[PDB]
From a paper:
Analysis of the structure derived from a cubic and hexagonal crystal forms revealed that both DBDs are composed of three α-helixes and a small antiparallel β-sheet. However, the comparison of E2F8's first and second DBDs to E2F4 and DP2, respectively, revealed striking structural similarity between them (r.m.s.d.=2.7 and 1.9 Å, respectively), despite the sequence identity being only 39.7 and 27.5%. The E2F8 DBDs 1 and 2 are thus referred to as DBDE2F and DBDDP hereafter. Of the 82 residues that comprise the linker, 23 are resolved in the structure, forming two α-helixes that wrap around the surface of the DBDE2F and DBDDP on the opposite side of the bound DNA. Whereas the interaction between typical E2Fs and DP proteins is mediated by separate interaction domains, in E2F8, the linker between the DBDs strongly contributes to the inter-DBD interaction. The two DBDs of E2F8 recognize a 5′-GGCGGG-3′ core sequence by inserting their helices α3 into the same major groove of DNA. The preference to the 5′ and 3′ flanking sequences is due to contacts formed by Arg113, Lys114 and Ser117, and Lys175 in the minor grooves, respectively. The major difference between the structures is that in contrast to E2F4/DP2, E2F8 binding to DNA is not symmetrical, due to differences between DNA recognition by DP2 and the E2F8 DP domain. The first Arg residue 313 of this motif in E2F8 DBDDP forms specific contacts with the oxygen atom of guanine G10′. We also observed an interaction between symmetry-related molecules that involved helix α1 that potentially facilitates the dimerization of two E2F8 proteins.
Whereas the E2F proteins 1–6 bind to DNA preferentially as heterodimers with the related DP proteins DP1 and DP2, the two most recently discovered members of the E2F family, E2F7 and E2F8, are ‘atypical‘, because they contain two distinct DNA-binding subdomains. They also lack the pocket protein-binding domain found in all other E2Fs, and thus are not regulated by the canonical cyclin-dependent kinase/retinoblastoma protein pathway. In summary, through extensive structural and functional analyses of the E2F proteins, we have defined the DNA-binding specificities of E2F and E2F/DP complexes. These analyses have revealed that the two domains of the atypical repressor E2Fs correspond to the E2F and DP domains, which bind to DNA sites that are indistinguishable from those bound by typical E2F/DP heterodimers.
Numbering used by the authors: 110 to 212, 259 to 341
Write the structure that this text describes.
DNA sequence: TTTTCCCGCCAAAAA
DNA sequence: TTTTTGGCGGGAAAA
C-alpha cells in the first residue's frame, strides 16, 4: 500500500504495451479506454488519456471515434522520427543549449506537440538534455515580454516527467542518471 | 533538503 | 444541458 510506485504511470503503461503486440496485422483491432478502465481495477481515465495522447504523438496509434482508438503499431516509427527530422529545427535547439550553458492552431496545444518536439530533439551528435530543453519549451511556448517566469516552467517539468517515464516502457529510451538520452531505433 | 510525479480539480471540445 | 478529453497546479512520497 504505502509504495508510490504501485500507481506509477510506467506500470499501467507497461501493461498497456503488454495489451497489444508491437507488430500486429490488420485484424479486428480496436481500443476502448473505458474498457481498459474496467478490464482492470484502475485507473481514473486521465491516465489513459495522457498515455494515449503521448502514444499517438509518434503515430504508434490513431483516433477512430469517441472512446474508440486503433492500436496500429511499430510501422511508422522510423518514418515518424525521420519526418520529425524533416520538421527538425535542430540548429535552434543546439544553439539554445549554447545559450543556456552559461551567461498551426494557437491552442493545439502542448501535450502531443511537446512530446513530438521532444522526440525530435532526441537526435543530435551530442545528446544533451533536458531541463535546458524545458527552457526551449518555454521559449517556443512564449517568445514574449512576459515572463511570466517562476511559474509555468515547473509544470512543463511535470508533463515532461510524464513523457519521460511513459517513454521508459518497452520503447526507445534509457535510464541514465538524470537528463537522459536514448533513441534505439534510427 | 530537492527531485520525482500522482491525484484530481476544473474547463475546453464533443455529444 | 451531460458527456468525454485534458490542461493545470498542489502537495507529498521518494531519492
Amino acid at each position: 500500500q504505502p509504495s508510490r510506485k504501485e500507481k506509477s504511470l510506467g506500470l499501467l503503461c507497461h501493461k498497456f504495451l503488454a495489451r497489444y503486440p508491437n507488430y500486429p496485422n490488420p485484424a479486428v483491432n480496436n481500443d476502448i479506454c473505458l474498457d481498459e478502465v474496467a478490464e482492470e481495477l484502475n485507473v481514473e481515465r486521465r491516465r489513459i488519456y495522457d498515455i494515449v495522447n503521448v502514444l499517438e504523438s509518434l503515430h504508434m496509434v490513431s483516433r477512430l471515434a469517441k472512446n474508440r482508438y486503433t492500436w496500429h503499431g511499430r510501422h511508422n516509427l522510423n518514418k515518424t522520427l525521420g519526418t520529425l527530422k524533416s520538421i527538425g529545427e535542430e540548429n535552434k535547439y543546439a544553439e539554445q543549449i549554447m545559450m543556456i550553458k552559461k551567461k498551426n492552431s494557437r491552442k493545439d496545444k502542448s501535450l502531443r506537440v511537446m512530446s513530438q518536439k521532444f522526440v525530435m530533439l532526441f537526435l543530435v551528435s551530442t545528446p544533451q538534455i533536458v531541463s535546458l530543453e524545458v527552457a526551449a519549451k518555454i521559449l517556443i511556448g512564449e517568445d514574449h515580454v512576459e515572463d511570466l517566469d517562476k511559474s509555468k516552467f515547473k509544470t512543463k517539468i511535470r508533463r515532461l516527467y510524464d513523457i519521460a517515464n511513459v517513454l521508459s516502457s518497452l520503447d526507445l529510451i534509457k535510464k541514465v542518471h538524470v537528463t537522459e538520452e536514448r533513441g534505439r531505433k534510427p
